[PDB]
C-alpha cells in the first residue's frame, strides 16, 4: 500500500464527518508520518534539478557557446524518461533510492555525449573543417571508447544486484536506475548527437574580436595543458620511485577499509520521537498515570513541541496496567532549535530520578518495517533446557556488564518484568467433613474476579452487551476473597478462609520465544561517538562470559546489518574481476587491462579520506559509492590507454605515444570529471530535512572522484609505460 495516498483518503474521510458531529466534539490528528514522506521526496527532486543546472554550467564554461551545450544537455532527460518506462515494465516504483540513483546518474549520462561534442569542437577549430564532414571524422575516432566505456560501466552494477538480504533490495534500486540510464545514453550518444551536431552547428571561425570572461578561460587552458606536459614528462623518467609511492597509497586504504567503524544506515530527524514507560509488576494504572503526568509537565514549556499523545495501558512489546507509550511530535524544522536527538536525552535525564520506573525516549527507525526504534536487537535465548529462572538470572549478569562499558548508553530489556503471584491450596478433607460440596467452592472462586458476558440487548439501534462482574470494592485485597461464604450441610455458612491457604511465589509474567527456543528480547542503543558494528561486536563478546548453554541471535535491523558486512569482499571481488575480463575482450591483451586495475585503489584512497575528515561511517551508502568509483575511475583510465595503444601501432614508440595521448585528451577527462564532481555538490551541502541520508551517499563519491582525476592523469602514464615496458 501507499503511505502518502492512504493517509490522504483518511484525511478526506474525516472532513466529511465534521458535518454529522454533535456540538462539543472535534476531530484531531495529533500524530502523522506522511507529512515527512512528502517533504523528503520533493527534497530529492529539488536536489535533482539543482544537479542538472550545475552540470549545465560547467558544460557552458568549456564549450563557450550555448548551442554546443544543449546537445549533451537534452540527452539527460530523454535518458531519464526512457528509464521511467523500464521501471514500469519491471514492477519498480518512485522512491528516494531510485531517485538517488538518478542524482548519481546525471553526472555520468552526459559523459558519453560530452566526448562527441568536444571532439567536433577540436576538428572544427583545428583544421577549419565543415561540421558535417567534421562529425564523421570525429566519430571514426571515438566510437571505440564509448562502446567500451558503456560496457565497462554498465557491468559494475550487475554483480551487486544479486546480493541477498535487505541490502540486496537497496542495491537493486541503484542497479536498474543507473545501469540502463547509461545504456540509454549510449545509443543516444551514437544515434541522436551526430544528427544534432551535423545540422544545428554553423562553422565557427576565429573571433577576430574575442572578448569576455570566457576569453581568459581558453588562453589559460592552453597554459595548463602546456604545463601538464612538462610535469608529465618529468615523472616518466622517475618511474621506479613513482611506483613505490603507489604501494604506500594502497596500504593505507587496505587498512583504512578494515579498521574504520561500520554501520548500516544513518538515522535522521523525522520530527517525532517515542517514549515508553514500564513500572514494576504490581503497579496499578493510577501509578502509571502519575508517571505520565510528570513526563507531561516537562514538555509543557519546551518551545519545540507541537503535541504529545499518550496511550495508557498499551505499549509495544507487552500490554498491562504498568505500561504506557507516548507519541510526541515536534514542530517543523525552520522554527525548531534543539533537534530531536538532543531532546530525547533531556527526557532521559529528568525522568531517571523521580518517576518510579524505566522511561526511555528513543528515536524512530531508519527503515519503517524493520523495527520500532533505532538501535540493535538481541535475542538472548537458552538452547539446552536450562529453565526459565536460570535464563532470567543470566540476563542481569549481562545487564551488569553493559552498564559500565563506555561503548554503550542505557542497554535495557523489552518486556514485562517478574512479579508476585498468589496461589490458593484447597483443603479437601476438611471440605468434605463440613458437608461442603466441592462444586460450590470451585465456582464461588471462578465467578469472583473475572467478568461474565451473558447475552445482548438493543441499545437505540445497536446490539450491545450485558456483562456481570463483582463490585469493585470487593476484589481489591486478598481479604475480600477470603470472606466469600459457601453453604454447608449443617445449615450455616463456612467462609473460604478456613478451607484455603494462600501462598506467594515469584514467576515471570511474559513467556517470549524465538526460533523454537525460550528467549528474552534485549535491546540497546550504542554510545555517542561509537558506531553500530562496534557495539554489535562488544555485545557478542560479553555473551561469551555467560553461563554455558545460553545462546544468542540477532534480529531485525541488526541481522540485516551483519548480513550486509559478510558480502562486501565478494561483491568488490566480482566487480573488479568482471571489468578486468571485459577489458581483455576490448583491448585484446592482458597487460593493458592490468593498467586499468591499478587506478581502482587511487579512487578508493579519496573515498576513505573524505569520510574521516567528516566523521561518517562505513554503511551501505558508502559501498554504493565504492562500486561507483570502480567504474568511473576506470573510465578516466580507459580514455588515455585506448588512444595510447592505437598511437603506438601506427608508428610510435612507447614513451612518445602516451605523452601525446594524455595531452590530446586532457580536455574531455577534466570535463566529465568535474561535471560528476559538481553533479554531487547538492548531495554534500544539504541542509534541511532528510539531509543526513544525502551526506552519506555524496561525500564518498565527492572525494573519490577528486582523488581519482588528480591522481589518474599523473599515474596511468606511469602504469602504461611500466607494464608494457617489461619486455
Amino acid at each position: 500500500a501507499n503511505a502518502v495516498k492512504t493517509a490522504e483518503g483518511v484525511r478526506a474521510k474525516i472532513e466529511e464527518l465534521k458535518l454529522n458531529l454533535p456540538e462539543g466534539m472535534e476531530f484531531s490528528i495529533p500524530y502523522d508520518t506522511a507529512p515527512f514522506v512528502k517533504i523528503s521526496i520533493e527534497k530529492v527532486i529539488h536536489t535533482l534539478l539543482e544537479a542538472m543546472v550545475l552540470v549545465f554550467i560547467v558544460m557552458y564554461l568549456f564549450l563557450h557557446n550555448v548551442r554546443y551545450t544543449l546537445i549533451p544537455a537534452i540527452v539527460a532527460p530523454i535518458a531519464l524518461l526512457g528509464t521511467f518506462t523500464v521501471m514500469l515494465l519491471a514492477g519498480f516504483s518512485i522512491n528516494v533510492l531510485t531517485m538517488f540513483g538518478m542524482v548519481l546518474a546525471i553526472g555520468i549520462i552526459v559523459d558519453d555525449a560530452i566526448v562527441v561534442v568536444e571532439n567536433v569542437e577540436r576538428i572544427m577549430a583545428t583544421e577549419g573543417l565543415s561540421p558535417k564532414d567534421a562529425t564523421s571524422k570525429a566519430m571514426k575516432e571515438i566510437t571505440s571508447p564509448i562502446i567500451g566505456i558503456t560496457l565497462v560501466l554498465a557491468a559494475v552494477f550487475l554483480p551487486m544486484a544479486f546480493a541477498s538480504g535487505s541490502v540486496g533490495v537497496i542495491y537493486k534500486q541503484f542497479t536498474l536506475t543507473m545501469s540502463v540510464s547509461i545504456l540509454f545514453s549510449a545509443l543516444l550518444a551514437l544515434i541522436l548527437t551526430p544528427a544534432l551536431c551535423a545540422t544545428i552547428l554553423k562553422p565557427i571561425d576565429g573571433h577576430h574580436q574575442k572578448k569576455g570572461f570566457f576569453a581568459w578561460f581558453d588562453r589559460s587552458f592552453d597554459k595548463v595543458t602546456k604545463k601538464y606536459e612538462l610535469m608529465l614528462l618529468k615523472i616518466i623518467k622517475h618511474t621506479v620511485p613513482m611506483m613505490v609511492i603507489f604501494l604506500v597509497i594502497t596500504g593505507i586504504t587496505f587498512a583504512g577499509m578494515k579498521y574504520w567503524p561500520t554501520a548500516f544506515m544513518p538515522e535522521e530527524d523525522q520530527g517525532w520521537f517515542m517514549t515508553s514507560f514500564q513500572l514494576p509488576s504490581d503497579a496499578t494504572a493510577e501509578r502509571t498515570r502519575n508517571v505520565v503526568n510528570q513526563f507531561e509537565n516537562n514538555l509543557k514549556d519546551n518551545p519545540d513541541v507541537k503535541s504529545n499523545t499518550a496511550i495508557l495501558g498499551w505499549g509495544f512489546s507487552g500490554a498491562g496496567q504498568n505500561v504506557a507509550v507516548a507519541f510526541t511530535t515536534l514542530k517543523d524544522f525552520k522554527e525548531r532549535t534543539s533537534s530531536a536527538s538532543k531532546m530525547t536525552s533531556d527526557v532521559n535525564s529528568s525522568m531517571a530520578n523521580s518517576t518510579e520506573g524505566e522511561t526511555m525516549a528513543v528515536l524512530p527507525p531508519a527503515i519503517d518495517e524493520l523495527g520500532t526504534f533505532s538501535g540493535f536487537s538481541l535475542r538472548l535465548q537458552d538452547r539446552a533446557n536450562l529453565g526459565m529462572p536460570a535464563l532470567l538470572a543470566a540476563q542481569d549478569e549481562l545487564m551488569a556488564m553493559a552498564a559500565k562499558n563506555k561503548k554503550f548508553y542505557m542497554v535495557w530489556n523489552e518486556g514485562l518484568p517478574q512479579g508476585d503471584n498468589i496461589s490458593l491450596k484447597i483443603d479437601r478433607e476438611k471440605l468434605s467433613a463440613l458437608g461442603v460440596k466441592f462444586s460450590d467452592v470451585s465456582d464461588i472462586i471462578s465467578t469472583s474476579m473475572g467478568s461474565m458476558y451473558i447475552n445482548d440487548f438493543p441499545n437505540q439501534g445497536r446490539m450491545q452487551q450485558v456483562i456481570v462482574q463483582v463490585e469493585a470494592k470487593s476484589r481489591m485485597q486478598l481479604k475480600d476473597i477470603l470472606n466469600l461464604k459457601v453453604m454447608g450441610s449443617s445449615g450455616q455458612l463456612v467462609s473460604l478462609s478456613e478451607v484455603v491457604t494462600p501462598q506467594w511465589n515469584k514467576a515471570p509474567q511474559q513467556y517470549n520465544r524465538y526460533n523454537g527456543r525460550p528467549s528474552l528480547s534485549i535491546a540497546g542503543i550504542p554510545n555517542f561517538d561509537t558506531s553500530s558494528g562496534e557495539a554489535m561486536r562488544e555485545m557478542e563478546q560479553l555473551i561469551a562470559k555467560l553461563p554455558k548453554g545460553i545462546g544468542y541471535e540477532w534480529t531485525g535491523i541488526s541481522l540485516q546489518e551483519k548480513q550486509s558486512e559478510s558480502q562486501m569482499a565478494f561483491l568488490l571481488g566480482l566487480s573488479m574481476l568482471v571489468v578486468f575480463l571485459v577489458l581483455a575482450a576490448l583491448y585484446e591483451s592482458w597487460a593493458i587491462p592490468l593498467s586499468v586495475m591499478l587506478v581502482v585503489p587511487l579512487g578508493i584512497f579519496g573515498a576513505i579520506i573524505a569520510i574521516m575528515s567528516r566523521g561518517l561511517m562505513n554503511d551501505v551508502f558508502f559501498k554504493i559509492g565504492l562500486i561507483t568509483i570502480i567504474g568511473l575511475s576506470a573510465k578516466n583510465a580507459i580514455l588515455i590507454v585506448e588512444f595510447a595503444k592505437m598511437l603506438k601501432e601506427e608508428g610510435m614508440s612507447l614513451i612518445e605515444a602516451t605523452v601525446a595521448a594524455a595531452k590530446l585528451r586532457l580536455r574531455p577527462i577534466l570535463m566529465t570529471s568535474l561535471a560528476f564532481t559538481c553533479g554531487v555538490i547538492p548531495l554534500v551541502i544539504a541542509t534541511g530535512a532528510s539531509s543526513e541520508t544525502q551526506h552519506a551517499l555524496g561525500t564518498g563519491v565527492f572525494g573519490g572522484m577528486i582523488s581519482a582525476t588528480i591522481l589518474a592523469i599523473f599515474f596511468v602514464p606511469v602504469f602504461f609505460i611500466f607494464i608494457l615496458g617489461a619486455v
Partner: protein
Amino acid sequence: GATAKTINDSVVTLIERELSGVKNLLYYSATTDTSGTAEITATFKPGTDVEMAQVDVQNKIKAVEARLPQVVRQQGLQVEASSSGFLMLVGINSPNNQYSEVDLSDYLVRNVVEELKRVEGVGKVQSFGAEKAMRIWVDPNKLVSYGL
C-alpha cells in the same frame, strides 16, 4: 482470562510446531502476556510474495485445531500480515467537557472506526476505547444474605 504460563503450553508451542517447515523463512517468534492473548510472528525472506506465504501458514494451523482448546476455537485464530507500526492516529476530544470519555469512545466505535476501514489500503484500525454495555456490579455480601 488465563495466565501466559498456560497459553505457552496449550496454544503457543502447538502452533510453532508447524511453522518450522514453512519455506522461505528467516525466523519466527512468539510472545504472551497477562492480557489473555498470544501472538506469533513469522518473518520471511526479503522478496517472498506476501500472499503465497500467507497461504502456507493457513495450511498448517488448521492441522492443529483438533488439539487446541474449545475456547480458542470459539474465539477463532486470526492470521493477518501487517506492518507493526502506526501510519496515523485519529482522535476525538471535547474541549468544553461536554461528553465524558465513555461517550467519546462509544461515538468512535459506532461511527468513525467502521468507515475508516472502507478506505483501501487501511490494514487494521486499533481502537483504544470500547463501546457501551450494560454493566451489572453485584455485591457478594448481599447475595449470600438471600441464599443466591
